[PDB]
Amino acid sequence: DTVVRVEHSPGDGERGVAVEVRVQRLEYCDEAFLHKLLQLAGVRLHYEELPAQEEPPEPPLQIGSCSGYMELMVKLKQKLEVAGQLGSLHLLLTPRQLQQLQELLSAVDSLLKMTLGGVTLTLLQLATHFFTEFDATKPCSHVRLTGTAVQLSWELRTGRRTTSMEVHFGQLEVLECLEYTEILTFPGTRPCAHLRHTQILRRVPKSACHCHSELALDLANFQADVELGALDRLAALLRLATVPAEPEQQTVFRLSAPRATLRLRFPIADLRGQAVRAEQLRLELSEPQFRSELSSGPGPPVPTHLELTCSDLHGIYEDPVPCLRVSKALDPKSTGRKYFLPQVVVTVNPQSSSDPEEMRTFQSRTLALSRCSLEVILPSVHIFLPSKEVYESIYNRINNDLLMWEPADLSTFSTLVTVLKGRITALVLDMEHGTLFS
Numbered sequence: 001d002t003v004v005r006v007e008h009s010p011g012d013g014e015r016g017v018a019v020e021v022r023v024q025r026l027e028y029c030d031e032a033f034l035h036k037l038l039q040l041a042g043v044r045l046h047y048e049e050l051p052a053q054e055e056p057p058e059p060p061l062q063i064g065s066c067s068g069y070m071e072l073m074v075k076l077k078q079k080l081e082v083a084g085q086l087g088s089l090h091l092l093l094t095p096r097q098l099q100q101l102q103e104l105l106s107a108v109d110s111l112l113k114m115t116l117g118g119v120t121l122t123l124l125q126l127a128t129h130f131f132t133e134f135d136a137t138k139p140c141s142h143v144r145l146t147g148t149a150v151q152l153s154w155e156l157r158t159g160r161r162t163t164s165m166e167v168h169f170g171q172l173e174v175l176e177c178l179e180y181t182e183i184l185t186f187p188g189t190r191p192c193a194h195l196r197h198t199q200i201l202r203r204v205p206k207s208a209c210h211c212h213s214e215l216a217l218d219l220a221n222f223q224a225d226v227e228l229g230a231l232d233r234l235a236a237l238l239r240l241a242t243v244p245a246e247p248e249q250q251t252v253f254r255l256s257a258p259r260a261t262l263r264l265r266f267p268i269a270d271l272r273g274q275a276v277r278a279e280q281l282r283l284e285l286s287e288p289q290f291r292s293e294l295s296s297g298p299g300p301p302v303p304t305h306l307e308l309t310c311s312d313l314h315g316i317y318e319d320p321v322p323c324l325r326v327s328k329a330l331d332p333k334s335t336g337r338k339y340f341l342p343q344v345v346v347t348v349n350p351q352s353s354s355d356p357e358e359m360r361t362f363q364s365r366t367l368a369l370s371r372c373s374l375e376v377i378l379p380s381v382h383i384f385l386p387s388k389e390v391y392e393s394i395y396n397r398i399n400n401d402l403l404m405w406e407p408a409d410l411s412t413f414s415t416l417v418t419v420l421k422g423r424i425t426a427l428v429l430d431m432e433h434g435t436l437f438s
Contacts, residue, residue, distance in 0.1 A: 002027035012105055016098035017047040017091065018054075019106070025066050034076035040086060041066040041136060045128070047093050062092030064132025068119075081112035087119035087138025087150055090131035094241055095123035096296055100209030103201045107161040113154040118147030118169065124178055125241045140176035140246065145198075147171060151190065160204035167195040170223065175237055177244035181229035192221035200249075208296040211249035218254070219288060224261040230275065232267030235348075235409065239298035243271060253292040260288030268405045277405035278318055279397060286313035299350045299410045303370070306346035313342070318397045321387035331379035331420055340379035340420075347373050351410035363414060363437050372413035384425035391426065403438070414438075 006028055011019030024042030031037055044067070048060035068086020075081050091099035117138035121131045124141055138150055151168035170187025187193030196217050206212030236243055247270070264283045268275035283289070287310040294304060312329065316322040331340035349370035367373075384390065407413055415438040422431025 002029055004028055005030070013049060014047075014098075014102035014105055015050040016093055017045050017102045018049045020044075026069075032076045032078065033074070035073055037071050038073055040070040041068055043067050043089060044132075045089055045091050045093075047091065047098075050098075060093065061126060062090070062128035064089050064129060064135070066136050067132035068135040068138060079110050079112065081114070083114045085116050085138075087115040087117055087135045087152070088121065088131075089135060090119065090121035090123050090128045092122055092124050092128035092131075094125040096125050096208050096241060099123065099125075100201050100211070103199075104203070104209040107158065107163075107202060109156070109158040111154070111156045111158070113152065113156070115150045115152050118145075118150030118152070120144050120146035125237075140174070140182065140244070141178060142174040142176060142182075144173065145171035147193075147195070148188070161200075161202040162204045163200055163202060164197055165195075165199070166197075167193070169193050170195050170219075175234070176242075177246065178242045179229075179247070180227055181247065182227075182233065183225060183229070184227040185223075185225045187219060187223035189221075191219060193223055194219045206249050208249055211251065213249060214252045214254070216252065216254035218256055219260060220257045221259065222261045222285075223257075223288070225263055225290075226261075228263050228265050230265060230267040230269060232269045232272060232406075232409070234267075235294070235304075236269075236271070238294050239296070239300070239410075249296055251292070251294045251296075253294070255288045255291045257288035259285060261285045262288070262290065264290070266405050270406075272406055272408045272410075275405065277401045279401060280319050281317055282319060283313065283315035283317070286310050286315045301350065303350075304346075304348040306348075308344040309341055310343075311339070311341050316385070318393070321385040322383075323385070323388050323390070323394050323398065324381060324383045325385035325388070326383045327378070327381050328383045329379040329381055333379075342376070342378050342381055345373075345375040345377075347375070348409050351408070359437065363416065366412075367414040367416070369412045370409075370414070371411055372407040372409050374413070374415045376416065377418050379419070380421040382419065382421050382423035382429070382431065384423065388425055390424045 006023040008020035013019040023040050026039035026041040028038050042065050044064045046063045048055040067089055070084040070086035072083050074083040115138050119131050119135035119138040122128055147169035149169055153166050155164035168190035170193030173185050174182045176182045197215050200211045200213045201209040203210050262283050266275050266277035268277055289308045292306055310327050312327045314326050327342040329340050332338050417436040419434050422434055423429045
């Protein structure tokens with residue numbers, strides 16, 4: 001007999017979401033490792049409980065039916081680890097403030113879990129219904145965190161829930177509006193896609209929902225980010241919810257690897273063929289890099305950094321063929337054993353914030369004022385592919401598509417270069433201790 005003995009129960013019904021553990025469209029066949037084989041399919045975050053007095057006239061589209069059997073129901077009360085057939089649900093409502101506050105209020109132990117298939121979450125900030133269907137299995141506006149073979153280990157150290165989560169697979173995040181113009185990350189295997197510590201939303205780590213989410217993903221394999229339409233289409237969707245169309249946390253995002261295939265494309269957005277700047281630019285199979293540091297609030301009062309490091313990365317840039325094909329920096333400098341390497345630093349400051357000595361100080365002052373940036377420290381790169389032309393190709397690309405890339409961020413910016421040895425391939429480079437400014 002399909003004993004239906006479950007419904008909405010007492011719970012902290014959030015402002016934006018209704019706390020109602022509903023087992024809908026499921027034969028709840030229940031027949032200290034106490035197992036009651038069940039079907040919790042149908043848990044729905046219909047949500048919209050705050051707007052328009054629950055918005056009863058228009059219930060939110062984000063709803064889940066048959067969201068995972070979870071039949072095994074491993075373990076019982078005592079580290080309440082559960083081996084399940086349901087991965088997770090997706091709060092398609094704003095995953096910055098409302099969903100974060102709901103999660104923080106609900107969490108207010110060290111339980112673990114082991115899901116199956118990595119539901120295709122579509123938190124946008126019936127797609128969430130697709131996420132629920134994928135939990136049953138577990139162009140744009142297609143933000144998807146779907147580890148096909150979910151190796152999620154929800155550490156969930158609630159002891160102020162200093163939670164954690166280590167996975168062996170990765171998502172595919174086409175992050176877009178509410179032309180293949182978004183990122184296309186395809187990390188997949190554990191080292192190949194070592195997704196780690198995705199969310200905290202707990203007052204213990206930080207004191208949005210006080211995340212302090214050190215998502216220091218440390219992978220060491222291909223994990224190709226095949227396409228990346230823009231860096232900016234990334235600051236807007238992170239500070240604001242999202243303002244694209246068809247067209248107190250401190251997010252410390254660290255990433256170190258010997259090898260991680262990657263594509264970097266500039267940001268030329270209408271709000272602030274393809275983008276003009278750096279046509280066909282690829283930091284191919286370079287070091288993983290692209291480590292960021294962001295914040296939920298728009299116009300970050302603290303500055304935003306974006307670092308990079310690489311020993312001899314074979315980044316085919318502006319590819320015909322790279323104008324510079326390897327960092328090639330064997331430049332020991334200090335008294336101790338040192339090996340200098342390249343870096344591409346970025347330092348963005350909020351909009352409307354607040355010659356050995358002449359040329360240096362003038363552009364230092366110009367660097368203290370930021371509406372965009374760019375920075376390079378190449379010790380001995382000096383490189384160029386055998387197919388390259390400093391006379392022609394560099395002129396045709398890195399001088400035309402250089403500053404006309406919608407330079408503005410929240411067009412007073414700066415630029416530096418520094419080389420201890422240079423080679424202008426094709427011819428008298430003669431370069432030692434040289435720079436370039438703008």
